[PDB]
Amino acid sequence: DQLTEEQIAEFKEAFSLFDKDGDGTITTKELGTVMRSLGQNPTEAELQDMINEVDADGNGTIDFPEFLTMMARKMKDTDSEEEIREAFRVFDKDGNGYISAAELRHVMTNLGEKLTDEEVDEMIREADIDGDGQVNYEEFVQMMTA
Amino acid sequence: DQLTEEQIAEFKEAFSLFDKDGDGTITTKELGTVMRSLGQNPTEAELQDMINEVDADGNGTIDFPEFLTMMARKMKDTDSEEEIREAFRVFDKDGNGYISAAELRHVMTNLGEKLTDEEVDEMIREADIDGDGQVNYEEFVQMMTA
Amino acid sequence: DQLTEEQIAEFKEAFSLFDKDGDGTITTKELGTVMRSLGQNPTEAELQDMINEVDADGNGTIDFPEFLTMMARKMKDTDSEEEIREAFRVFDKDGNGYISAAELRHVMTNLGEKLTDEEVDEMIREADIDGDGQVNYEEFVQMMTA
Amino acid sequence: DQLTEEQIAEFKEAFSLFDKDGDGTITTKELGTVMRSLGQNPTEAELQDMINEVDADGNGTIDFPEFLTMMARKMKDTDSEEEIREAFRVFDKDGNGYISAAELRHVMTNLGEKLTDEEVDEMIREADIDGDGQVNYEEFVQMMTA
Amino acid sequence: SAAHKRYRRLQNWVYNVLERPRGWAFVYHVFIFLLVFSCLVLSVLSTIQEHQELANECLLILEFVMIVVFGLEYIVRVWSAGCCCRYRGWQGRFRFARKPFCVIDFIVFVASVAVIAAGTATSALRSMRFLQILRMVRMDRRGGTWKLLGSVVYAHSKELITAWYIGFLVLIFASFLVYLAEKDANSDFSSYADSLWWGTITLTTIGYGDKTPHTWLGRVLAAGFALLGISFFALPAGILGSGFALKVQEQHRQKHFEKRRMPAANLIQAAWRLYSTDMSRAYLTATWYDDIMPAVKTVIRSIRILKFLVAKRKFKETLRPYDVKDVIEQYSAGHLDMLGRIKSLQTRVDQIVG
Amino acid sequence: SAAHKRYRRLQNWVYNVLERPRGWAFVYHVFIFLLVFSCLVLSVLSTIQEHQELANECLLILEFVMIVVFGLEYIVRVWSAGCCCRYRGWQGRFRFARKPFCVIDFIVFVASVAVIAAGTATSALRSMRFLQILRMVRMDRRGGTWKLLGSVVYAHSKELITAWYIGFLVLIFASFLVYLAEKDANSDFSSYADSLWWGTITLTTIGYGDKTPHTWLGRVLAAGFALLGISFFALPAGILGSGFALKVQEQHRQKHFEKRRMPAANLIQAAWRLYSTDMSRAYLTATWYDDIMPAVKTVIRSIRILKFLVAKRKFKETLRPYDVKDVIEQYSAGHLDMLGRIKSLQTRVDQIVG
Amino acid sequence: SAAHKRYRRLQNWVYNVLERPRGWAFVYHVFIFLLVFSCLVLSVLSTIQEHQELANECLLILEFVMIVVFGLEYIVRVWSAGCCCRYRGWQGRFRFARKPFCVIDFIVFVASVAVIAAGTATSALRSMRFLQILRMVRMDRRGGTWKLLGSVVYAHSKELITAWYIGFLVLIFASFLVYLAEKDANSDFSSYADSLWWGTITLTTIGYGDKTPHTWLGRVLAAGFALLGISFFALPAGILGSGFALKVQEQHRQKHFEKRRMPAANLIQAAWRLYSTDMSRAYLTATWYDDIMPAVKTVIRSIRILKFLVAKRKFKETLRPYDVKDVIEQYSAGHLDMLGRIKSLQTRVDQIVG
Amino acid sequence: SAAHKRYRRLQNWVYNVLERPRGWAFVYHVFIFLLVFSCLVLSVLSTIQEHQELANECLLILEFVMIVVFGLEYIVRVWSAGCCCRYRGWQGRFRFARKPFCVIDFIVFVASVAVIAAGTATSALRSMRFLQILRMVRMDRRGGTWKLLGSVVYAHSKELITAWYIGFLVLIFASFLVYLAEKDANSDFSSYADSLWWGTITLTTIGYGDKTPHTWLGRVLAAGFALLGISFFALPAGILGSGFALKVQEQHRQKHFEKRRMPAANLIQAAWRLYSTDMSRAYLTATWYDDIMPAVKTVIRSIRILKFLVAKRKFKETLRPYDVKDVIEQYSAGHLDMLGRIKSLQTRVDQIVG
Ligand SMILES: CCOC(=O)Nc1ccc(NCc2ccc(F)cc2)cc1N
Ligand SMILES: CCOC(=O)Nc1ccc(NCc2ccc(F)cc2)cc1N
Ligand SMILES: [K+]
Ligand SMILES: [K+]
Ligand SMILES: [K+]
């Protein structure tokens, strides 16, 4: 999946929605302004955490090379596949790489940034559930890392 | 003490005082309303705890089968006899199955949901107190579990 | 020092200043009222602690037998001599039964219910201080327990 | 560097700016008044700590002998050289007696009573920085203790 | 019935001294111990061909005394069990006898009596003297020692496994190396099996001395291996000891907290209040005399049953241990309640003055 | 495909029992252990010149059974690996075979088969019986025991060095002093080397008994020196055991906290939300059908990627342990928020009334 | 009386060095130790038939010196006791002599002198040399060591009992099994008693070597049982060692808290204030000169007695340890006081504005 | 001066590897160790009359190599010390040489060279080979091991004394009792001294086997006494091991706190600010050019000196440990500040509205 030049131009056009002034950088102001226009309400500390994940210069900005790297990579990297698989394993006590559909539903809608019923319905539909009702989450992780 | 059909009908008539709408369920609204009419003042968290002790479906209700089971059983089960006997043993340091009348009186009127003087007077009258003033609480437990 | 009958009558006359009603008992009301008339200001919890030290019946009162016992005994008992001597030993690190006049002065005026300068001056005058400036506190304890 | 009599007279003239009344002592009032006239704003607890560092009598004052001792000594004593060198060693993990110019800059401007950029610029200029960018702080300590 | 109550107190005292001793009751059990253990020793002294005569003589008397004492103890305990309310009447006594250790004690006693009777097959009459060890095994109340040892071993599985794996490798390697050096010079190390026997007897630090290295290479090789090997072999005795000590300390820790308290006291109260619904003078009035609206009293009883069940649960839960994060939880509750109080002030100031 | 799912469940069960056992799966591994260990013992009994005949007979049968069993186990595990998604197809099976311990097991099996074949150079056919010990060495999953031992030894380096330094000085001294006293009277202590051998064999508490002091001066010196010397030699075993116990206790401590929780659950959610940006029915509407303003959806995806990366980090961080100073931190946060609340009241009172 | 005070200081110094040493005073006691212990050794060297002559010679001089030194020490201590105020005058000295260890020391000294006198029944004059060990036993101040050992043993009763029960069973079983295998081949295991002796001498890891298994079955059975048995026998030592260490650590812990403080200081003050009621210049005024209304001063004294008794109790209580739940208690007190403060604000706002 | 800085970096690296190693620098010291230790071993092999020839040959070469290596190391370290600023110039090098261990190393080297020279009194030339052990003793940086051992022994002095007192009494008693039983039958126990030797050799679990009880009474007493005696003798090792482990654990605990921090950083700042009073461009202005009112700048400097002294103290204090009662102290500070804030609200409401 070599990154092509047209794909780079489409990332550039998204990057320019944040950096409307043409300064080549995205600060918490530019990021948070676009987010709130869509009806999101991040906090300042959440905007700083997000920028810090890709800001190698440590000056509180995202530049286009950092933006392009994040967009090209998504979740395809091996670190993402391993950590997501480690998160499922927290809820796999048997150690057999399986989790019950009903147990997945409980964790997704009752912990963390809970999924809505419709979100979790789409998630269980997308996993090829076995007839017992058990989900092989390691093949679920490869579908999100492909 | 086989549960008879007339006994079932008398439980049904009590159950219907709670569930006046005929919906077949008792929620915190129905339970707490009957209780406050008698001058009791449970909290919401106390009404939830009470219903949760017999709500197998986990949906916050008591149905008639659960109500009937609780009423038929009272304290006659072996779990009740053992736990009540374990509670007395907390206050039996000798380990001989005895507790002093005066020590029972102190615990009943000074700890927990304290008994009134008249309540505790009736309780000590009902235990066949020995001439020393010592109470054999394991036969006291069988009288409440009979 | 056999307790004589005239000594008993003088204790009775003091006891009657507290128990002005002739009820034969001293409660926190009677004790605290006499104390505040002299310009003292004990708290309620301090009045309860004081009565509790001599109230064997545990009903919150002092009767004349308890009052007479306390007055006849003062500090002459062996428990008082030992505990006072143990208190000095807290401040005797050498373990030789001595404490410096200047160290006694620091502890008396800087810890606890501090002595005034004039109080502590009288206390150091009363101990037969050695020429070095060291106080043998065990003979100081016998003078207060004699 | 024998302390001369003219040097003593110049210390006396500074001491008299604090002790304008001629009482021979500097309290928190005299010290803090001169400091605030120059636009400093110490707290009362900071003025007490400062006086306590040189007040051997423990009465909350600085007299001229204590003032003269502090002024004659500055940082030239061996205790100062050792403690300052121990402070640098906190930030020398290698244990080789070196610290990076950039690491010195981070610690000086980000911890404690942070140096301004211009202060820290003068400090790095004064250390004979090596071509790598590493500072030998033990010779930096001898220049401040000379 | 004062005599009846004296009888009941005597029974409860005897049953307390027998079933669950405390304080001075031990002065009995220890005795029984020294009575069986002693017998055992005599049995061993019977095996020697030098003391057989006197040993058998003493064993006759001791077996007689022991059979009498254990018969008395068994009858007394079977009669004492009656004190408790569980086993009443001869049916209850029988139910008591059905216990496992009771029938064990009875079987051992009947075996002893049958043996002493047949005494008047001496080989079997001597062999069965081993039975007495069951009298001690009977001192284990539900195998407490085995369960404790198993718990402590399982909790430390990884460390214990590491000591055995490293120790086994050192044993194999050292035995082979020493055998390679002592092969021809010394006659003790004729085969590898002899070298392994020597290696075990040395690494365990037993050191019989029937096999020892003679050449200097073997000696230097054995000295280096023994220092590394001896520590690994003794590593388990230390791990388990520290485990037992730490377990005892932490357990003693939780004894001080006494957090269970209040739940046991409330359970008895909810049980009494439920029970008294059906017998209290509070319900023996013209008002309660049931004929027109029976359900009212039934509803009141149903509420007391629900509260009893809540109290029984809270009581069972107290046994479970609690974390040290409670202080954070009380600050969270305290802060939230206070922050809500300042809000209620703020809203009222904004309501009146605006 | 119900049969396909039965197939997959069977595969996952077999792979679970083989690669990472739990609960009852151990009943398999233990078996394999007793199958190899037993063989080892027989090999040793082959060295004795008394039991060689029967031992070789039994070893033939046992080697046959072991080769068959290990071939079966290897084929089953290679087929079972397919269950996981990593190794699929014959390319994936091959990738599985490339593992180190797999090729180790294969080499050992081929060696056993070649040996039994050449059986029909007997010295080498006996020498290679040592290979089986590799079957046990293979039980170490990435040398856990070695790493644990190394960690515990390194953590106690200063304490361990003191025991060795003090112990070495005592051994050098006691040997010299005893040799000075036993020099002429006893023939055992002919040279200093003999005295050193005796000193080591004595201080380690092995005590072979081939060398012992005979004169009274030597006996007194040996008595006093051994008491000081024996404790120092046994000091290292005592330190490592307590270290293992304390480590196990503290580790078990952190298990109760369960602080990682929430981060793992949120990571799966941020990953699902990011993934669903490109397939959800939420984006299959006329509104989203991309042609006029593609960047809007790209910007929405870029935000979900950033949140996913925040959740992955918070998830990895949970593994790291946390200090007990959190309570101070919550008081600092709670006090600051409340002090700011009283300020906001004060400013509003001062605004309205002044 | 400056000379009197010099006298008193000398007395207190001597009594401090004798009764309760600290710091450098030990340099005395250690000396006395090496003076008695040495004597003991010489006594033992008297038993040998080779050194009897020189040993008796040295013992004469040493007994003379020891009798003189202990007489001097006893006289000095009896005179020194006078320093304290408890024993004053010859009646007080006598009261001091009545102590148990004092009369013990006196009896030992008189016995030594009578023996050396009768020297000018030599068997008894040698037998009584054991008496000196009482001089060391006298170093125990109220048997501290015995009480410490008993406390630590009682606190760990369950683990200790588990180690003995498992250890006893393993010993019996291993002895029997090895005896069954070595019965006929080896002559050492002639009877079961010999097997038990071997089993004990092996499991304790003593390993004399006079009895060892000869047949291979016995060796294999002995080897496996020896490994399991050796760990159980050494388990007690480790348990008690860890117990002592943990006890010392926790005790040292409580030393840092120093919570008792304030109570001891206040007790002296309440005692002085009570005492001064009857001698202070504050009461030597015309106003207080008692003739018209004696009860007023008596009432004032009665109040000071009650406060003294409160201070004595609070002082005795400080010795008792305190829990770590105090922080929860201070939050409960702090929250309650603050919540009551917001209520008092709320009521006043509602009073004025309504 | 780039070459000068390369020179200085080289010097600092060499001095770091020599004086205070870390990480990979150990690969040097270990080497030196194996170079001296090896020599020692060879010296011992010189004592045997069988290997003397080859041993002396090897020792010649090894002594030559060792003398060369240590001379090189000494010259390199003496030159390397120059890197630090303390010792500069030949006066500084000399000051470096005056250290104790430096002169020790120099003396040992000169002794080795003089010995090898005189080689071309062989008894002394062999005796001085012991000197090398000083090369290892030199590895102790200010006797760390001795101080650690002393600290741990002193902290558990009460526990250690109890083990010795109980153990000594058992040895004195068991020896006497066994001697009473073996007196006439066995020839080993001819005198009490022999019984004491046997008792020590048994209780320490050495078990030479030259003395053993023969009569059954002696065996029973020995077996009973050994079980009680062996545990008491093995206590000190367990106590000290648990002590070392607990000490290491608690120390590692304090590593996590990292509380000293801020004070060290502030001290450098106050020192720089004081120093810069006399050289900063901030004071090189017409305004500061001192002629009319010198005291103003002197007063400013006096204030910076006082602040420097406050920062030095706060920095030195950080090394001292801190208690766990800080949380109570922060609640006390937080509550007091908040209670004072509600008072300031109350006073203002009462001021305006009244
Ligand atoms: C808790 C009960 O006691 C023990 O755990 N005992 C023990 C067990 C094994 C070892 N390791 C050596 C070894 C292991 C396996 C073999 F086959 C041969 C030798 C050492 C001890 N002390
Ligand atoms: C704290 C003092 O030291 C001991 O507790 N010693 C000890 C006591 C018993 C055992 N168990 C073996 C055994 C027990 C009973 C028997 F009758 C025969 C053997 C082991 C030791 N080490
Ligand atoms: K041993
Ligand atoms: K041995
Ligand atoms: K031996």
Side-chain angles (χ1 to χ4, degrees), chain F residues 67-329:
Chain F
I67 186 177
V68 129
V69 150
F70 274 131
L72 233 21
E73 185 259 30
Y74 181 79
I75 232 146
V76 152
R77 182 221 302 265
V78 160
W79 169 91
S80 153
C83 96
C84 195
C85 177
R86 180 93 153 106
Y87 328 92
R88 312 205 68 94
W90 71 332
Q91 323 158 347
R93 295 333 214 283
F94 192 109
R95 176 144 46 265
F96 182 74
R98 289 173 62 254
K99 253 184 126 199
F101 276 135
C102 187
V103 72
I104 290 240
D105 211 89
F106 176 86
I107 293 189
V108 170
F109 160 91
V110 68
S112 209
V113 59
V115 159
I116 257 36
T120 282
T122 205
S123 40
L125 288 63
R126 192 258 155 266
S127 289
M128 44 57 60
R129 290 240 191 73
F130 97 90
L131 274 193
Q132 285 313 348
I133 187 83
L134 298 209
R135 205 87 55 160
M136 280 175 6
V137 190
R138 185 167 102 318
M139 291 209 186
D140 249 341
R141 160 185 288 174
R142 316 204 51 166
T145 53
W146 301 103
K147 288 194 300 188
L148 179 42
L149 170 70
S151 129
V152 185
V153 152
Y154 175 83
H156 293 273
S157 152
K158 208 11 202 197
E159 279 65 356
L160 275 170
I161 284 187
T162 274
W164 306 341
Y165 181 61
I166 300 294
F168 174 71
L169 277 192
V170 161
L171 165 73
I172 263 33
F173 212 37
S175 262
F176 178 65
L177 269 204
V178 161
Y179 161 85
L180 266 200
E182 303 293 75
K183 196 146 58 71
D184 53 20
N186 188 327
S187 138
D188 292 328
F189 301 86
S190 88
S191 73
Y192 187 81
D194 286 306
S195 178
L196 249 197
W197 171 248
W198 166 92
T200 268
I201 281 309
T202 288
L203 284 202
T204 75
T205 65
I206 294 172
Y208 278 145
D210 55 338
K211 300 179 165 294
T212 59
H214 280 352
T215 70
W216 280 114
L217 187 54
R219 279 174 180 182
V220 156
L221 289 176
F225 269 146
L227 298 174
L228 266 146
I230 283 161
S231 287
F232 289 131
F233 271 55
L235 240 216
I239 299 177
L240 288 185
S242 283
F244 281 127
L246 291 185
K247 185 194 216 41
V248 150
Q249 185 205 54
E250 198 120 302
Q251 275 195 189
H252 162 82
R253 184 80 55 59
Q254 310 318 58
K255 265 353 125 235
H256 270 219
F257 264 1
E258 323 152 307
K259 228 254 333 234
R260 142 159 147 182
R261 243 251 148 189
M262 279 339 236
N266 254 287
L267 173 54
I268 301 169
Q269 292 157 347
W272 175 253
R273 286 187 163 118
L274 167 59
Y275 175 81
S276 74
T277 306
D278 302 309
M279 57 71 62
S280 180
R281 293 197 175 241
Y283 292 102
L284 303 171
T285 73
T287 289
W288 290 105
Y289 275 107
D290 182 78
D291 157 72
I292 303 189
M293 308 180 65
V296 176
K297 190 176 185 185
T298 305
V299 153
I300 293 174
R301 182 190 296 107
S302 78
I303 288 151
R304 293 219 175 100
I305 296 181
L306 283 171
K307 292 179 175 169
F308 166 83
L309 293 174
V310 170
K312 191 174 65 177
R313 177 188 53 81
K314 292 186 183 313
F315 176 60
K316 291 203 270 203
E317 266 162 8
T318 59
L319 174 278
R320 129 205 96 161
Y322 196 42
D323 292 351
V324 102
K325 99 123 158 254
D326 167 32
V327 280
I328 273 165
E329 193 161 282

Side-chain angles (χ1 to χ4, degrees), chain E residues 153 160 163-164 167-168 171 232-234 236 240, chain F residues 37, chain G residues 227-228 231-232:
Chain E
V153 152
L160 272 172
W164 314 338
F168 175 72
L171 174 60
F232 288 130
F233 271 55
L240 288 185
Chain F
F37 185 87
Chain G
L227 290 175
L228 262 139
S231 278
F232 288 129

Side-chain angles (χ1 to χ4, degrees), chain C residues 18 30-38 40 42 47 50 67 70-71, chain G residues 270 274 277 296-310:
Chain C
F18 293 105
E30 292 80 37
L31 172 67
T33 294
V34 167
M35 291 172 68
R36 85 182 191 258
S37 79
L38 299 166
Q40 305 174 36
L47 294 178
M50 288 161 79
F67 187 87
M70 154 194 93
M71 301 298 295
Chain G
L274 167 59
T277 306
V296 176
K297 190 176 185 185
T298 305
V299 153
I300 293 173
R301 182 190 296 107
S302 78
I303 288 151
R304 293 219 175 100
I305 296 181
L306 283 171
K307 292 179 175 169
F308 166 83
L309 293 174
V310 170

